[PDB]
Design an enzyme around this catalytic site. Sequence first.
Site, mmCIF file in Angstrom:
data_model
loop_
_atom_site.group_PDB
_atom_site.id
_atom_site.type_symbol
_atom_site.label_atom_id
_atom_site.label_comp_id
_atom_site.label_asym_id
_atom_site.label_seq_id
_atom_site.Cartn_x
_atom_site.Cartn_y
_atom_site.Cartn_z
ATOM 1 N N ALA B 12 0.825 -1.200 0.000
ATOM 2 C CA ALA B 12 0.000 0.000 0.000
ATOM 3 C C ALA B 12 0.862 1.253 0.000
ATOM 4 O O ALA B 12 0.618 2.181 -0.769
ATOM 5 C CB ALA B 12 -0.923 0.003 1.191
ATOM 6 N N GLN B 15 2.839 1.624 -3.537
ATOM 7 C CA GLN B 15 1.989 1.969 -4.666
ATOM 8 C C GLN B 15 1.343 3.344 -4.493
ATOM 9 O O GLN B 15 1.023 4.011 -5.473
ATOM 10 C CB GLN B 15 0.924 0.889 -4.864
ATOM 11 C CG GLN B 15 1.528 -0.478 -5.146
ATOM 12 C CD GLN B 15 0.513 -1.515 -5.588
ATOM 13 O OE1 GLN B 15 -0.560 -1.650 -5.000
ATOM 14 N NE2 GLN B 15 0.857 -2.264 -6.630
ATOM 15 N N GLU B 71 9.295 -8.083 0.209
ATOM 16 C CA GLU B 71 9.013 -8.982 -0.897
ATOM 17 C C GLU B 71 9.065 -8.161 -2.193
ATOM 18 O O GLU B 71 8.532 -7.057 -2.242
ATOM 19 C CB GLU B 71 7.652 -9.647 -0.667
ATOM 20 C CG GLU B 71 7.279 -10.758 -1.620
ATOM 21 C CD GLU B 71 6.511 -10.274 -2.839
ATOM 22 O OE1 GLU B 71 5.943 -9.159 -2.805
ATOM 23 O OE2 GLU B 71 6.468 -11.034 -3.829
ATOM 24 N N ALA B 99 5.529 -10.815 4.974
ATOM 25 C CA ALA B 99 5.161 -11.073 6.358
ATOM 26 C C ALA B 99 3.822 -11.788 6.476
ATOM 27 O O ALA B 99 3.300 -11.948 7.579
ATOM 28 C CB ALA B 99 5.125 -9.768 7.137
ATOM 29 N N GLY B 144 1.252 -7.066 7.025
ATOM 30 C CA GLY B 144 2.224 -7.475 8.023
ATOM 31 C C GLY B 144 3.472 -6.617 7.970
ATOM 32 O O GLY B 144 4.045 -6.266 9.003
ATOM 33 N N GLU B 183 -6.431 -8.304 9.865
ATOM 34 C CA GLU B 183 -6.008 -6.906 9.809
ATOM 35 C C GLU B 183 -6.365 -6.116 11.071
ATOM 36 O O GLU B 183 -5.628 -5.212 11.451
ATOM 37 C CB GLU B 183 -6.602 -6.232 8.573
ATOM 38 C CG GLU B 183 -6.113 -6.882 7.293
ATOM 39 C CD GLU B 183 -6.428 -6.096 6.036
ATOM 40 O OE1 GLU B 183 -6.325 -6.672 4.936
ATOM 41 O OE2 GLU B 183 -6.766 -4.907 6.133
ATOM 42 N N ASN B 206 -10.039 2.862 3.424
ATOM 43 C CA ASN B 206 -10.286 2.376 2.072
ATOM 44 C C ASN B 206 -11.779 2.305 1.763
ATOM 45 O O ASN B 206 -12.181 2.406 0.612
ATOM 46 C CB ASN B 206 -9.658 0.996 1.867
ATOM 47 C CG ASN B 206 -8.254 1.057 1.286
ATOM 48 O OD1 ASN B 206 -7.829 2.066 0.727
ATOM 49 N ND2 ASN B 206 -7.531 -0.046 1.405
ATOM 50 N N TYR B 224 -7.004 -0.584 -7.037
ATOM 51 C CA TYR B 224 -6.023 0.121 -6.226
ATOM 52 C C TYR B 224 -5.553 1.374 -6.958
ATOM 53 O O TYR B 224 -5.309 2.409 -6.343
ATOM 54 C CB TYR B 224 -4.834 -0.785 -5.899
ATOM 55 C CG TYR B 224 -5.107 -1.815 -4.825
ATOM 56 C CD1 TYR B 224 -5.844 -1.493 -3.693
ATOM 57 C CD2 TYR B 224 -4.623 -3.112 -4.941
ATOM 58 C CE1 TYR B 224 -6.090 -2.427 -2.712
ATOM 59 C CE2 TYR B 224 -4.868 -4.056 -3.963
ATOM 60 C CZ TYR B 224 -5.601 -3.708 -2.851
ATOM 61 O OH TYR B 224 -5.848 -4.644 -1.872
ATOM 62 N N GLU B 254 4.831 22.606 12.234
ATOM 63 C CA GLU B 254 3.625 23.418 12.245
ATOM 64 C C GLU B 254 2.367 22.554 12.127
ATOM 65 O O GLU B 254 1.303 22.929 12.622
ATOM 66 C CB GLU B 254 3.680 24.446 11.114
ATOM 67 C CG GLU B 254 2.786 25.654 11.341
ATOM 68 C CD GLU B 254 2.954 26.722 10.278
ATOM 69 O OE1 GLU B 254 3.985 26.711 9.575
ATOM 70 O OE2 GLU B 254 2.051 27.576 10.148
HETATM 71 N N1 LIG Z 1 -5.485 2.208 -0.703
HETATM 72 C C1 LIG Z 1 -4.711 1.155 -0.936
HETATM 73 N N2 LIG Z 1 -4.733 0.089 -0.072
HETATM 74 C C2 LIG Z 1 -3.947 -0.987 -0.304
HETATM 75 C C3 LIG Z 1 -3.113 -1.033 -1.409
HETATM 76 N N3 LIG Z 1 -2.457 -2.212 -1.385
HETATM 77 C C4 LIG Z 1 -2.853 -2.906 -0.297
HETATM 78 N N4 LIG Z 1 -3.787 -2.164 0.372
HETATM 79 C C5 LIG Z 1 -4.467 -2.509 1.624
HETATM 80 O O1 LIG Z 1 -3.473 -2.951 2.520
HETATM 81 C C6 LIG Z 1 -3.949 -4.018 3.309
HETATM 82 C C7 LIG Z 1 -3.003 -5.197 3.147
HETATM 83 O O2 LIG Z 1 -1.707 -4.743 3.438
HETATM 84 P P1 LIG Z 1 -0.518 -4.754 2.359
HETATM 85 O O3 LIG Z 1 0.069 -3.382 2.150
HETATM 86 O O4 LIG Z 1 -0.998 -5.327 1.054
HETATM 87 O O5 LIG Z 1 0.533 -5.761 3.051
HETATM 88 P P2 LIG Z 1 2.096 -5.420 3.181
HETATM 89 O O6 LIG Z 1 2.329 -4.091 3.845
HETATM 90 O O7 LIG Z 1 2.722 -5.469 1.807
HETATM 91 O O8 LIG Z 1 2.675 -6.561 4.159
HETATM 92 P P3 LIG Z 1 2.694 -8.139 3.815
HETATM 93 O O9 LIG Z 1 1.700 -8.854 4.681
HETATM 94 O O10 LIG Z 1 4.066 -8.639 4.137
HETATM 95 O O11 LIG Z 1 2.405 -8.366 2.357
HETATM 96 C C8 LIG Z 1 -5.355 -4.326 2.844
HETATM 97 O O12 LIG Z 1 -6.266 -3.770 3.763
HETATM 98 C C9 LIG Z 1 -5.461 -3.652 1.496
HETATM 99 O O13 LIG Z 1 -6.776 -3.217 1.252
HETATM 100 C C10 LIG Z 1 -3.085 0.040 -2.282
HETATM 101 O O14 LIG Z 1 -2.352 0.015 -3.267
HETATM 102 N N5 LIG Z 1 -3.888 1.130 -2.036
HETATM 103 MG MG LIG Z 2 2.981 -7.293 0.573
#
Ligand SMILES: Nc1nc2c(ncn2[C@@H]2O[C@H](COP(=O)(O)OP(=O)(O)OP(=O)(O)O)[C@@H](O)[C@H]2O)c(=O)[nH]1
Ligand SMILES: [Mg+2]
EC number: 3.6.5.-
Lengths: 427, 437, 334, 54
Positions: B12, B15, B71, B99, B144, B183, B206, B224, B254
Amino acid sequence: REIVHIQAGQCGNQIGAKFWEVISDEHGIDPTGSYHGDSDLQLERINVYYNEATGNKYVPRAILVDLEPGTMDSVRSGPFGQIFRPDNFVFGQSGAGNNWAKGHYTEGAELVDSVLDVVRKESESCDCLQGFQLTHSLGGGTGSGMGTLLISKIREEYPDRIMNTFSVMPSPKVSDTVVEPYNATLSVHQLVENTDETYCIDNEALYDICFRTLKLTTPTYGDLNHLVSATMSGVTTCLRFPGQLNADLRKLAVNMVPFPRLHFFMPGFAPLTSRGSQQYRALTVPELTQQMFDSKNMMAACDPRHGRYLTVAAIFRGRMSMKEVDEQMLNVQNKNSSYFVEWIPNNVKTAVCDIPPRGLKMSATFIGNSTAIQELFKRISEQFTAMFRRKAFLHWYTGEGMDEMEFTEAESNMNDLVSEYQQYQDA
Amino acid sequence: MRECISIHVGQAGVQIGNACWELYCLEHGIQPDGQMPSDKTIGGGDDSFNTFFSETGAGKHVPRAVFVDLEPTVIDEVRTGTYRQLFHPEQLITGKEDAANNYARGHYTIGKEIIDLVLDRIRKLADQCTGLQGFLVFHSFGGGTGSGFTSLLMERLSVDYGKKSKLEFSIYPAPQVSTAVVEPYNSILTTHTTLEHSDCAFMVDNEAIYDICRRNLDIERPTYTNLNRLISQIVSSITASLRFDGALNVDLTEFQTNLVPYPRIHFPLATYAPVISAEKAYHEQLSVAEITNACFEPANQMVKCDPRHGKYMACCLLYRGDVVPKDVNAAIATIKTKRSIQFVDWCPTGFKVGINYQPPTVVPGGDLAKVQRAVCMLSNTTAIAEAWARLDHKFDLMYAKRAFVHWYVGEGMEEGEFSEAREDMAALEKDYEEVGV
Amino acid sequence: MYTFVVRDENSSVYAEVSRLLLATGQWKRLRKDNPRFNLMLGERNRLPFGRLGHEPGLVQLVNYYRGADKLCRKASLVKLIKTSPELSESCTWFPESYVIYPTDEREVFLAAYNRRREGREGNVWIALISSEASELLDFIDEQGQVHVIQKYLEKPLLLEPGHRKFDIRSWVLVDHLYNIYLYREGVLRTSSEPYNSANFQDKTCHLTNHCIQKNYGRYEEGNEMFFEEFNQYLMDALNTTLENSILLQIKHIIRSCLMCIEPAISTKHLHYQSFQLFGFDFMVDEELKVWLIEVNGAPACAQKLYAELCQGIVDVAISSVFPLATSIFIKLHH
Amino acid sequence: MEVIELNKCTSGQSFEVILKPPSDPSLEEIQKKLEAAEERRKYQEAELLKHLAE
Ligand SMILES: Nc1nc2c(ncn2[C@@H]2O[C@H](COP(=O)(O)OP(=O)(O)OP(=O)(O)O)[C@@H](O)[C@H]2O)c(=O)[nH]1
Ligand SMILES: [Mg+2]
Ligand SMILES: Nc1ncnc2c1ncn2[C@@H]1O[C@H](COP(=O)(O)OP(=O)(O)CP(=O)(O)O)[C@@H](O)[C@H]1O
Ligand SMILES: Nc1nc2c(ncn2[C@@H]2O[C@H](COP(=O)(O)OP(=O)(O)O)[C@@H](O)[C@H]2O)c(=O)[nH]1
Ligand SMILES: c1ccc(CNc2cc3c(cn2)[nH]c2ccccc23)cc1
Ligand SMILES: [Ca+2]
Ligand SMILES: [Mg+2]
């Protein structure tokens, strides 16, 4: 992330062979191992199950195990027989005589290290091995006895890797010998301790489905295996093709398994189809959702209305309204929220893949972690006790060095598993 | 000038970082290869945009950013993306296995083998800084990595950079977009461990962004990409005052001063208007009064809650486009007589207004239409605690049965950390209630 | 097949509503803590509004308006009226009231009655009732919780036969669109003791509550006079009707109260939706002037009217949102 | 009502409008906790290999 496939015994190698037959067709891989598709979505997750071979050839990361050469010679002379790496053919000569002890303690022990050498040789190539998958039955000797011996020894050498299985449950309706309940019980004890996901494929269910539903008067093992390869293909779709889900076996296991011993899943599939008989009518999404949740489509002869869903995974395949899928999925839950536990929020998850299986324009695969699976284990436990209370047929095992206590223990552990499933059914 | 380093953790975070930096480049007239024709001080500078970009002798403008994921596959799409030449390899850090949506695995197990590396790559950016203010940390609550590795990092940064400020951009978990079931565990855990280390955090649910994309952009099932381009707009509004000439929120310090009177309660609610579809054939441009009025509509908030049933502690209005103070004061005066806006007694009931004349920039081929004037309101309302209540309830349901807990304990975590984290959150819910009623 | 939950068991009104819903065969009751509901019949205290409207694929509706307690509690109502310009302190239909915390609005309370001491004007108040302020100023202090002291109507309208005191109870329903529906059937909760202008150290004479009077069943069964009777008595004894002499003032007070707080509780553009049943308690003096006494957020109904009212609630508040496979209400337009 | 601290420039302007006046852990314990959790894994990994050895 690469997966190592292992198939043990008669049942294990026959469903395993047909699995590779099916998904090799999905991935456009031919009986020799040369790619021949149209899409490249066919290939960016193909290293998961296949090894790249010199000459643009692809070779299954597959290990074929048996204590008899009979079945594996059928495989090798089978349709996709020559696709498999010939060194991965590890086999004994004596057989296991449908005896768990022979597979686990004597005949199989003699052979297991040779198998582990092939595993090790595969794992060594894997840039990041994510886990193993095994195909076997629990009613025989090799797949049951030796299969669980392999699992035990793989966990020793790879304690931090995912181990999943596709485990065929015995049933008097589809029975080779009377000792299948003994072999099954011994194996469940092993699976409870050393697996992350076990897909419980009941031969009872596969039979009933073939006769009650699919219009087959006398279904053969071949017919039964049409259903199993279709399901195996469906559960692995998300790992074999690009899509929404950025998840490995571990991440997937985490979200399906709230309790370490309760990881036995009811697989399901829609539409149910015989082999040969064409399908002209594509199911609407509401039909796919309704069917994959109906007991008649479950591969484990358990009534999901007799238990509660801990978690649920669903995989729709084909070209369809992702919106409409969400509505229908959300509909079912809100229809029957009593059959889902309320203390695991949002426990039903869905994924979609644009590539449909062969022959169907759209399909769904159901993976249910229901407490109703206790019905399966209670069933085995009854058949077990009925013989064991008279110590019947036990000499086949004590002759291989086993003691009665080990049976008493195995019996107790499964009655514990049952009682544990019952705990969360009344929460 | 004082520099800011942006840290993007997990999928998240990465990206979304992509979305932001893409947008930044367009707003500053920087091209994918890092060339910025309008910058006449070749090789360096002291300008406001240099807060977020450094400069090379070759004239390249490179983000003061570090991407980190446990990863590779997500950051690999940055190594091969359209802005590949913008960053340099040492900025992008990848582990091998993630994770698995396990906080414990991201924090303790896999976090440990990469924490020293990241801090080094971060230290290499801070050595290029003449005056570092601190960090902007992008991450998800539910991941994670996004939850576990972030709290670990936030702890160390408070040690290696004690006097530096740290802001968060946090993605609050939504079932419609999420797929993990654990989560809530990850969210409570990482909030508990990061709370004393975060000066100000902007939560984005989200769920809210999703409905905004459906309702106002007419996208049936937002991706996404849809979510992140909208989030980047909001973030760009919040950071514009650090990248552009102005006198409101010019440094990270600030942000806390203007928005966070009490440290623990450092979660300002963001509200953004207008969101207009690009495929919308016919549109009537909205006025200063209309877009300012939309800032008190729940359907435009980054988190769905009801500010009417809480109290304000602060409130900033950030405008972009054709806006003058006169129109703002009239719009404020009108809205107040019609809406319920209760401040805490120990706060002046007023608004800090920021205006940048440049209207909001849109990504070509994006879902958002160009508008003549837009606004983002940053209000520290106690109503945002509804989001904590939701999260804490889901946590309680699962934990009462100790469901999934074994996954965390199996990574070395103690079951006590769960209850500790939950008690800290129970305190936090009461802090909000003391102030709010 | 819609779904609902019940989180208030002592609700005499909504236990009846839950029953009607099940009888339709298109509603399904889940248990207290099941989040996947369409309708919530919530508790009176600490109802978790923060958890509503966050269930994907579910339109959610609750039988309470968040923030509507500022109208349904004495201390708040006074503050609400006095601070709200659309009502103001000049408000003609609310008895002059004051907020009084125990050891604020006390210094002012003294000043108001100090001419009433020597204005030779009626000077009786209520929290209980007294002519001496000092006597109840630290009756409040002996209790512990904040109280409201208010103008006492010592010249009320008196029902004959009996020379008795009474209060009127009106049931109001506010749906999700904030349509204000007045229930056409109300009730007079009458006293049976001849009103004693002298001694109010008794309760039965100056307190018309339905509990405390159990002179029961004398003139009407229930100490409960319905509008058909009260209308008839008005026509015979004062040559006027109920609509004209009283109900217009009732409909005006109701509408004024809810319109005042509409922008604070409306769920027009919210992610979850609200409706709620209120019970307004009025009182008439001898000049046929109606005074608002209070508003009840969790009102109980009269026994004859339960069937009709609770069916009305389903019709316009619930089925209006969750439709199934002449009116008993009067819409107060605005 | 009262507009104050009006600051202007080419990029825009900023001000404040008032409508009503009012009325850390050291690296000591971090690496200690990280390692105290690591040998909680090692202990669990050991009891497994012990269990498997049996
Ligand atoms: N807004 C938004 N939410 C995202 C995006 N990618 C994942 N999420 C949210 O992030 C959560 C999952 O966490 P991730 O960021 O995919 O996991 P991670 O931080 O890569 O950690 P890992 O478990 O190791 O893969 C979910 O609630 C998804 O809806 C994104 O590109 N944009
Ligand atoms: Mg991931
Ligand atoms: N200012 C006043 N003048 C005359 N009588 C009054 C009065 N205030 C209250 N009463 C009497 O007290 C009764 C009820 O008191 P109040 O309404 O304050 O308590 P209450 O809440 O128990 C009514 P409910 O229970 O129906 O909400 C009224 O019905 C009326 O008989
Ligand atoms: N579905 C299916 N089940 C089988 C097949 N072959 C055997 N079984 C089942 O597996 C059990 C016998 O195990 P088997 O694999 O033949 O023994 P093994 O080769 O020694 O491991 C019985 O319960 C059979 O019903 C098969 O091809 N398909
Ligand atoms: C071997 C290899 C691979 C598989 C499949 N495993 C799997 C898949 C999923 C899952 C838990 N496990 N949860 C999901 C939710 C949505 C979509 C898919 C899944 C079994 C055996
Ligand atoms: Ca420069
Ligand atoms: Mg056989």
